[PDB]
A paper describes a structure:
Kainate receptors, a subclass of ionotropic glutamate receptors, are tetrameric ligand-gated ion channels that mediate excitatory neurotransmission. Each KAR subunit has a multi-domain organization, including the amino-terminal domain (ATD), involved in receptor assembly and trafficking, the ligand-binding domain (LBD) that binds agonists, competitive antagonists and positive allosteric modulators (PAMs), the transmembrane domain (TMD), which forms an ion-conducting channel, and the carboxy-terminal domain, which determines surface expression, synaptic localization and interactions with intracellular proteins. Here we present cryo-electron microscopy structures of the kainate receptor [name] in the presence of the agonist glutamate and the positive allosteric modulators lectin concanavalin A and [name]. Concanavalin A and [name] inhibit kainate receptor desensitization and prolong activation by acting as a spacer between the amino-terminal and ligand-binding domains and a stabilizer of the ligand-binding domain dimer interface, respectively.
The [name]-bound group of [name] particles includes two subgroups, with one or two [name] dimers bound. One protomer in the [name] dimer contacts the ATD, whereas the second interacts with the LBD. There were two types of [name]–LBD contacts, with the predominant type I contacts involving the A or C subunit LBD and type II contact involving the B or D subunit LBD. The type I [name]–LBD contact is mediated by carbohydrates attached to N546, the glycosylation site conserved among GluK1–3 subunits, and the type II contact appears to also involve carbohydrates attached to N751, the glycosylation site conserved over all GluK subunits. Although single N546Q and N751Q substitutions substantially reduced the steady-state currents, dramatic current reduction was only achieved in the double mutant N546Q/N751Q, suggesting the interchangeable capability of carbohydrates attached to N546 and N751 to serve as [name] contact points. Our experiments with mutant [name] channels therefore confirmed glycosylation of residues N378, N546 and N751 to be critical for PAM action of lectin [name] on [name] receptors.
Author numbering:
A (entry chain F), B (entry chain E): 1 to 237
Write the structure that this text describes.
Amino acid sequence: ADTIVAVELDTYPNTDIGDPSYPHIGIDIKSVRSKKTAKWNMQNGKVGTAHIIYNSVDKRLSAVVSYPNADSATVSYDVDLDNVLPEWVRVGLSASTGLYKETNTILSWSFTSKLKSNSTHETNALHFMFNQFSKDQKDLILQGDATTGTDGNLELTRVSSNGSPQGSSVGRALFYAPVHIWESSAVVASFEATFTFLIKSPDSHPADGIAFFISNIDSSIPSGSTGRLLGLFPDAN
Amino acid sequence: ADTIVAVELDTYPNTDIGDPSYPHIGIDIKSVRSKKTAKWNMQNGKVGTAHIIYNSVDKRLSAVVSYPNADSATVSYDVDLDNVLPEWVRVGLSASTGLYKETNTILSWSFTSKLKSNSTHETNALHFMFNQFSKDQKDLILQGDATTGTDGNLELTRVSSNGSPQGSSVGRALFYAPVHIWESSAVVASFEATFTFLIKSPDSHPADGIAFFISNIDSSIPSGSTGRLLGLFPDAN
Ligand SMILES: [Ca+2]
Ligand SMILES: [Ca+2]
Ligand SMILES: [Zn+2]
Ligand SMILES: [Zn+2]
């Protein structure tokens, strides 16, 4: 398989393979069996605010989710990013669904790497601010059945049936450029993300969530993920 | 031919094809026949400080170069980036020489676009700070005969024969990711650069200059450019 670490904002409680009995936020080191979990409200179509950092002076890998007028879920996990994730990566988004429908609209996304040339000697960035996912955005290598455009939206489903987004839809949003990580020059590359989603209520028990992965520079949709495999896992372990 | 706009930090006076009598800074719209030139010092092996902006609030493609203990050579040309430079681009550096030698050591490089979702609404970036050109940098699709690494350097020559870098060699340094420009979402993307270089005196009348282009998303070394074509124009017109 391909080595990949994601932040599952899972919206079906996958009762048989490791997730809790509630729709949560998790974090995944190569395994859909997660490393932390945290309770999530699951509001209807409301916007977004999720935020993921990792320094290596404090080596916790963090994430929060708060709708505006809602609380935050600090689902931070301590893991050693030294030996778990390859030197040059390809960041981006992954959502899926299967037999249940939900909206996986992303409207904005950002990033900032800062990797330790000689720690003070002017580290390297890849910062962006994608508030405007257009029709013909071409630094995205969006796999699967992802769409974009028509508005400022990134639609990681098969959409526009009145926003009832055609279940067993999987879509990935691999960003174009690579970033140095593994450790080697050490690994304080304090990568940030802003993950402003929209999960509309389709009045249909909405369930499978969007992830935010960091993968190897090569990828595909692994062995089918039309459902609980969450777009990036080949296997349910 | 490839639609291209360069900014020349020329060291060779090309009287025949149209450069003035001294080593100059200039600016190019689809031709080596520049629009404006200015006085540039051309010292020996010293370092670096160049700077290129374009604010469409002011439509000046301004450019200065300073050695420390030197002046600032403004070569700003009125150009409307509306109709001259493609809807998605591929930025990068370009150095070349032919029949004369020069060292074209680049030691750091940067960028910052800021492009107008809805003018205030959180312009998109692509900021990087390459102070750490590695041996195996892979967000560069460096063309020609450019090299990198072994130290923090981006050697746009064939070099290391005591760094007297083996005349008639060309190498460009195309960055990986594109930028939306042409106008379409209007063109206030104030793209900045910082271009810390080092032109060693080879004891051989140092000549052919380094550039800074914003080309099409495809390019090459055009039709052979071992010399006056400055790495990027197919023809001298
Ligand atoms: Ca699920
Ligand atoms: Ca020339
Ligand atoms: Zn889960
Ligand atoms: Zn010139």
